[PDB]
């Protein structure tokens, strides 16, 4: 049996088991501090509804805060296939303010881009279950949707924000609700008569510390290494059906950046990062006589079909100099996340990492844009020559072309995720760099 494996040991095993340091059969667990976690509802200021801007101040119920989940109640304004992550679309953006200083801000599109790159497998599916209707629910259906926040302290207890160490500073979240949500109150541009206004609630998960840990947090200085999101929306050099557009986008970024991320999209259709086509799932009515390539199959807005994406190639320059070899859009869509994240990224969403492990919290290589006076993203687009209504043309085409309907993807969203330090001392706090 196995003893014969153990016994047949020699010189080549010296680097594996000689002068052994560890075992695997006996684990010492670390004794830890005494704490408890509780999910407590915050009161929202302002009226929640479509298009409204509301905010909440986080109550000092516990000592530290971590996870935050925004709850919503939405109803279906049409049948299955008419909505796409509507709770995510609804939460247009969230801004984090500490001590009156802006610390960070996320956007509905960021939540979508973030998800596209960093969530995966059943985490991604479950997330979808928390933001959309995924069991073919019908018009009038009502559902409780959860949108976990993605601020630095919402990902790990490691960055729990010590409200207890902020005795003189308040912490607030500002939330913008979309004026319209597809399949909920608007069907494309058409308002849905009788649509309900959403309800909303913000829940904060608090950590209650025991006496010794609680005292240290209240009295001692704390320095947290945190992430921040930089974001600018801009116009796309929308590709022609006759040629290949290009675009030089100066990047107004700063601080040590782990990665850049971007997508091309259609602002009229949330989550649309690709062209529409008469192939299954790629448009309303796809596969039949009624197919139209101006309206998406909203429930299937996202896709892995790169033929409907518009980036031919791209490079990033630093201070006018090429950072890396020019690479194909499919590199940035499929390989970058393979190499650095390990999940699958939907077509139309691109990533370029400067970090070995961008999905973690531990720094692993950064590009400091505060030292790059002329960082620029240089894009080359595909030719929009393919007749989107004909699968023979949509599915049988070349690497460098896309759908004629790809010209609907006129917006470009470029994100950068960087590091900063949130310094808390003597009951007050803010960023080291701002």
């Amino acid at each position: 049996g196995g003893l014969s494996q153990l016994v047949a040991y020699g010189a080549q095993d010296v680097y594996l088991t000689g002068n052994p340091q560890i075992t695997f059969f006996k684990t010492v667990y670390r004794r830890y501090t005494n704490f408890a976690i509780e999910s407590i509802q915050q009161t929202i200021n302002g009226s929640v509804g479509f298009g409204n801007k509301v905010s909440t101040q986080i109550s000092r119920n516990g000592d530290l805060i971590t996870d935050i989940v925004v709850e919503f109640v939405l109803t279906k304004g049409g049948n299955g296939g008419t909505t796409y992550y509507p709770a995510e679309e609804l939460l247009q953006d969230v801004e984090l303010e500490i001590g009156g200083q802006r610390i960070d801000k996320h956007y509905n599109d960021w939540f979508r881009t973030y998800d596209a790159l960093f969530r995966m497998n059943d985490d991604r599916y479950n997330y979808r279950r928390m933001t959309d209707w995924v069991n073919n629910e019908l018009v009038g259906a009502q559902k409780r949707f959860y949108v976990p926040l993605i601020f630095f302290f919402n990902q790990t207890p490691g960055l729990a924000l010590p409200l207890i160490a902020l005795q003189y500073h308040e912490v607030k979240l500002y939330f913008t609700l979309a004026s319209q949500v597809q399949g909920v109150n608007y069907n494309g541009s058409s308002a849905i008569a009788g649509a309900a206004q959403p309800t909303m609630s913000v829940w904060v998960d608090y950590i209650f510390l025991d006496t010794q840990e609680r005292t240290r947090f209240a009295q001692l200085p704390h320095e947290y290494l945190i992430e921040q999101l930089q974001f600018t929306g801009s116009e796309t050099a929308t590709p022609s059906a006759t040629t290949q557009a290009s675009q030089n986008i100066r990047l107004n970024f700063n601080h040590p950046t782990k990665y850049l991320a971007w997508n091309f999209n259609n602002p009229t259709n949330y989550g649309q990062y690709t062209a529409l086509a008469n192939i299954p799932g790629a448009c309303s009515g796809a596969g039949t006589a009624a197919a139209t390539v101006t309206t998406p199959d909203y429930g299937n807005t996202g896709t892995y079909n790169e033929q409907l994406a518009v980036l031919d190639s791209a490079k990033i320059q630093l201070n006018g100099q090429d950072r890396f070899a020019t690479r194909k859009g499919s590199y940035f869509n499929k390989v970058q996340p393979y190499q650095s994240i390990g999940g699958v990224t939907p077509a139309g969403v691109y990533l370029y990492s400067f970090a070995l492990k961008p999905a973690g919290r531990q720094p692993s290589g950064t590009c400091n844009f505060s030292r790059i006076d002329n960082a620029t993203l240089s894009l080359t687009y595909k030719t929009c020559s393919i007749d989107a209504t004909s699968p023979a043309a949509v599915l049988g085409n070349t690497e460098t072309v896309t759908a004629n309907t790809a010209t609907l993807l006129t917006a470009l969203n470029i994100y950068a995720k960087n590091y900063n330090v949130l310094r808390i001392m003597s009951g007050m706090g803010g960023l080291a760099y701002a």
Binding site: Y32, T33, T156, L220, E223
Partner: protein
Amino acid sequence: FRDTASIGFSDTHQDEKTLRFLKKQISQFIKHLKEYYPNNELTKKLVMKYSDVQLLPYTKGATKDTYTSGLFDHTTGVIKIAPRDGLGNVRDEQSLNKSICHE
């Protein structure tokens, strides 16, 4: 960093002289009919076939740098007395800079 000190040209031991070199040997030696000298004195003829070199230096010191072996890069739950590694998130540079900027 290819580590190739080679000249890469036929100049190391090629001896690119003409046939006049055979007469130069008679100038290096002392003769008029050399058909009997190398049949007897081969050591001197081997002495007249030797190259002159020149050596090259360079030096850079050493980089004594500890703190390596970063295998587990997920995260690391701090010890109980965290304010020993906590005041390292920002070093003395971005701590002294904010005090000098007060003037």
